[PDB]
Amino acid sequence: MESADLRALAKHLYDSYIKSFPLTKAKARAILTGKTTDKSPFVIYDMNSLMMGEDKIKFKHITPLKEVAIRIFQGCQFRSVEAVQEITEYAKSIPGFVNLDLNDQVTLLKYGVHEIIYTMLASLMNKDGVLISEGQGFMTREFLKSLRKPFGDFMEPKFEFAVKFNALELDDSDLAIFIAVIILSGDRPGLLNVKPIEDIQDNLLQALELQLKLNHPESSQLFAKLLQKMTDLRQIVTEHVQLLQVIKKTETHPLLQEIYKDL
Amino acid sequence: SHMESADLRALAKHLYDSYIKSFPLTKAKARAILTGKTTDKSPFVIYDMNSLMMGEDKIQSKEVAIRIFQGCQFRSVEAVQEITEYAKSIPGFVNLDLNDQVTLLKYGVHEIIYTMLASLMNKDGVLISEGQGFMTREFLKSLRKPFGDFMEPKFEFAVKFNALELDDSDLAIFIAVIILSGDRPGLLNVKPIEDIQDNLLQALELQLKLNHPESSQLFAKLLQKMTDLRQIVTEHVQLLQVIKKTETDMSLHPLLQEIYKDL
Ligand SMILES: CC[C@@H](NC(=O)c1ccc2c(c1)c(C)c(C)n2Cc1ccc(F)cc1F)c1ccccc1
C-alpha cells in the first residue's frame, strides 16, 4: 500500500529477525573472513581434527554412540531441531500470522522450515565449508564429501546452492523479508484458508521488492532472481527427503527417534 | 502490568498455543463431551461385556483384559509422541544437552499423561477413542487380576485433581514445569534446567492469579499435587512387574520399554 508502510514492515521483520536468530549472516561473514578480533573457529578438516573438536567444542549431542559418519549426521539434526524453534518464534512476529487458522499455522511451518533451514544455511557457508556450533567451528566441505556413502552426499547439494545463492549478496534485512515470504506460501498441501495467507504474502512481496530496490539499486532484476531461488529451494528439499528416506534403512534409540521423527 | 508481567504473559500465551497444536483432545473439548450439552458430541458408553462388544468399529480373538490393556499402550505411546512434540516448543528445551532432553522426557512423560488423563475423567469413567467412547470406572475395576487394579489410582487422583478446576491454559504451563524438573536422575546440567523452570514457575504463578483470582493459594495446592503423581507412577511400575512375569506371552511397547528401563 503506502511506500512508508512497506519500510515499516521491513524494519519490523529485521528487528524480529535479530531477536530470533543469534548467528546472523553479518556475524557469520565476519567469522568466515576475520573480524580483526582473532577468535577464529576451530576447523574440522579430517578425522583427527574432528576428534579434537569434540574435546574442545562444547557439543551437546554426544550420546553414547558408533560410526563417525552417523555422529555428524546426528549433530546436524540436533541443530535442525533448534533451527525450527527459531523459525517458529520468528514466524509468530510476522504481522497476521498468529491470527491465521491454528491448523494453517502448523501447516505453513511444517512445509516451510526445510526451505528456511537451507536458506539460512547458506549464510554459514562458503565454497570450502560451513560454520557449526554457533560459529565456534568450521567443518570443511572436502571432509563432508569424504564421508562414506550415502553420508558423503547430503551436504554437497547445499554447497552448490549456497555458492549460487550467496552470489546474490543479500544481507540480513533482505533475508528477513525473504524468509517471511517462504513461510506464507499459500500452496502448502492441506491449507484450509488460503486467502489471508496469500494476502499477507503479497504484502510481504511488496516489502521485499521495495527492500531490494533501495538496498541494491544497481541490481536490475534481483527481485526476480530471488524468486527463482525459491524454486531451487524446493528441488533440494525434495532431493533431501529422498536421501532422508534412504536413511532409516541404514540406521537400523526409541525416545531419541521421537525427538528426531522429522528430517 | 509491568514489563516483567508482559514477558510472563507472552510465555503463557506461547505455551497455550503450542498446547493446542500438540494435543488434539483438550480439556475444554473433553468437558463438552462429558457434560452432554449437545447431540453430536455424545460418546458411546462401555459398562459391561455386552456394551463392549456393541461399540465396535469406532474410528483379534484376544482376552478382554488383554485387549483393553493393549489399547492403553497404544494411546500411551501416542501420548508420548504428543508430549515430545510439546516439549520441543518449550523455550530452551531443544537447546539443552541431548542426554538431558531424553532424561527429562523419560521421567516426565508419566506425570503428564496421568495429569492430562484427569481431563478425560469424571467420577464414573474415562473418555476413550479420541472422545468417541466412554469406559466406566466399575467396568475397568471388574477386569481380572491384576488388570482391574490399574486405573483405580488414576481415578482417585483425577477426582481430587479436577477439584482445582484448571483449564487448558493453566495445564499448558503446569505441564511445562513438570518437563523441566532438575531433580531427575542422571541429569548432566541442572543449572540450565532450573533456570527454565524458574521462568515457567514464574509464569504459572501469574497465570493462576489472573485466571483464578478468587482461588486462594491455588499455585501452592497445584505444586503439592506432585506427591500424588509420583505415588501413581510407583504403583504403576509395580503392577507392570507383575504382568511381566505372569503374562509372559506379551510385552510392553518398545517406546514404553525404554521409558521404564532402569527407573
Ligand atoms: C504412562 C503410560 C501408561 N499409560 C496409562 O497408564 C494409561 C491407561 C489408560 C489410558 C491412558 C493412559 C490414557 C491417556 C487414556 C485416554 N486411557 C484410557 C484408555 C484409552 C483408550 C483405550 F483403548 C483404553 C483406555 F483405557 C502405560 C504404560 C505401560 C503400559 C500401559 C500403560
Numbering used by the authors:
A (entry chain B): 206 to 270, 275 to 461, 466 to 476
B (entry chain A): 204 to 262, 273 to 476
Sentences from the paper on this structure:
It forms a heterodimer with retinoid X receptor α (RXRα) to play key roles in metabolism and the maintenance of glucose homeostasis through modulating numerous target genes. Sequence analysis and crystallographic studies reveal that PPARγ displays the conserved nuclear receptor domain architecture, comprising of the activation function 1 domain essential for ligand-independent coregulator binding, a DNA binding domain (DBD), a hinge region, and a ligand binding domain (LBD).
Here we present an analogue of SR2067: SR1988, a non-acid partial agonist of PPARγ. The asymmetric unit of the crystal was comprised of two LBD subunits with homodimeric architecture. The indole moiety of the ligand makes hydrophobic interactions with Cys285 (H3), Ile326 (H5) and Leu330 (H5), and the 2, 4-difluorobenzene interacts with Cys285 (H3), Arg288 (H3), and Ile341 (β-sheet). The phenylpropyl moiety forms hydrophobic interactions with Leu453 (H11) and Leu469 (H12). Previous structural studies have shown that rosiglitazone stabilises H12 through a network of hydrogen bonds mediated by the thiazolidinedione head group of rosiglitazone, which enables robust recruitment of coactivators through stabilisation of the ligand-dependant AF2 coactivator binding surface.
